[PDB]
């Protein structure tokens, strides 16, 4: 009779940086996706491979809730087959993705007068991420041919950059909290069902 803990994913007190995006595994519970879709707090709510109205009546084996924070103009990168700093180096969705992407403007929570520098993103990386891959390394990016030996400087970049996140920022540069629900149909007893 357990309700799925969607509250502690969406209404979580603090969110993770996009490079270290948090993942919650939902299993053995009953959830109502209609109430999520009913809520008008969300500015983005696009589903892929499945419709939201036919989501509270389909059983899945596991549901993964990935949550992180990015800025406005990067929200469009959280989709199958997109390019950019976020989709390439931080959080990549597969092309056969089956799930929904939810986002809402969190400028009232994630902005400081003077700048919130706690939310980071990976700016340099030698190659693109596989779908659903997380890279939390803090190694110096060797851009040139000379090795860096863990010394920051010329052709030796720090791989993480911080968002500005000031209240006076434009909407495209304001923080957005993203929750990506992915549904998997493992050949197994489907526990996560809708009601």
């Amino acid at each position, epitope marked *: 009779t357990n309700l799925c803990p969607f509250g502690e994913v969406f209404n979580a007190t603090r969110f993770a940086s996009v490079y270290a995006w948090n993942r919650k595994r939902i299993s053995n519970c009953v959830a109502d996706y209609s109430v999520l879709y009913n809520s008008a707090s969300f500015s983005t709510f696009k589903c892929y491979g499945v419709s939201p109205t036919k989501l509270n009546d389909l059983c899945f084996t596991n549901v993964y809730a990935d949550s992180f924070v990015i800025r406005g103009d990067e929200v469009r990168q959280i989709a199958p087959g997109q390019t950019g700093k976020i989709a390439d180096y931080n959080y990549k969705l597969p092309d056969d993705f089956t799930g929904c992407v939810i986002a809402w403007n969190s400028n009232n929570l994630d902005s*400081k007068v*003077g*700048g919130n*520098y706690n939310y980071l993103y990976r*700016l*340099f990386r030698k190659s693109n991420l596989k779908p659903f891959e997380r890279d939390i390394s803090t190694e110096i990016y060797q*851009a040139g041919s000379t090795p860096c030996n863990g*010394v*920051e*400087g*010329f052709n030796c*970049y*720090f791989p*993480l*950059q*911080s968002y*500005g996140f000031q209240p006076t920022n434009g909407v495209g540069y304001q923080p957005y909290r993203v929750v990506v629900l992915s549904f998997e149909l493992l050949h197994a007893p489907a526990t996560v069902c809708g009601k």
Partner: antibody
Amino acid sequence: QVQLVQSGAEVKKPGASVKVSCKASGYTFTGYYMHWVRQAPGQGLEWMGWINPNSGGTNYTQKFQGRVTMTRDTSISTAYMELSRLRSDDTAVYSCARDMAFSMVRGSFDYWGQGTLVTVSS
Amino acid sequence: AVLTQPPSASGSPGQSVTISCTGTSSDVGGYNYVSWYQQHPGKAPKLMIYEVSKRPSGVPDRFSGSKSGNTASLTVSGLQAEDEADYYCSSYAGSNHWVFGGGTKLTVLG
């Protein structure tokens, strides 16, 4: 519009220390490396070192190691340069210069501060 | 290790003048990261050339940079009165260090 506003002029005696500030505005302070350059009156430019306001890492040229200290406070977008054990020939205008490259150090400065005159008199 | 720069370069209005900047094989001749700055008296330096020959936006085409061996060169074609200032070259010197040149005063012969 980028603005690098430095602290006022300082008068010091040999053996003392000085702290110069450099508050940035008009851009994401953590996005660009900050350099420190001094210029003695009538003489030429002299590179001192750099700091990354993002990571906090620094590098100093050899002649200033052991006497210079570069820090930053991201909450106020200010870079600091501290010179200890001052001598007469340390009298110069100290300036903070922003690296024009984004999140990389490449040694080309596109915005300068107005300078901070530091006079070490007898 | 300072970059050797001639003390005075000069020319008549409309003439072309070249300011040299001789380093070593571990700064000028080692990397293509030579810069040139223009400083009018009492004002902050202005970036005129970066990466040997590239011009920032707004810098006149009359200013052009080049490099041969351990010696870089800043050339000013069509010399004008407002070009009278001090010019410093810069270069990466390895080990995360940059270095300046001694400086050259460019005088429009009056």
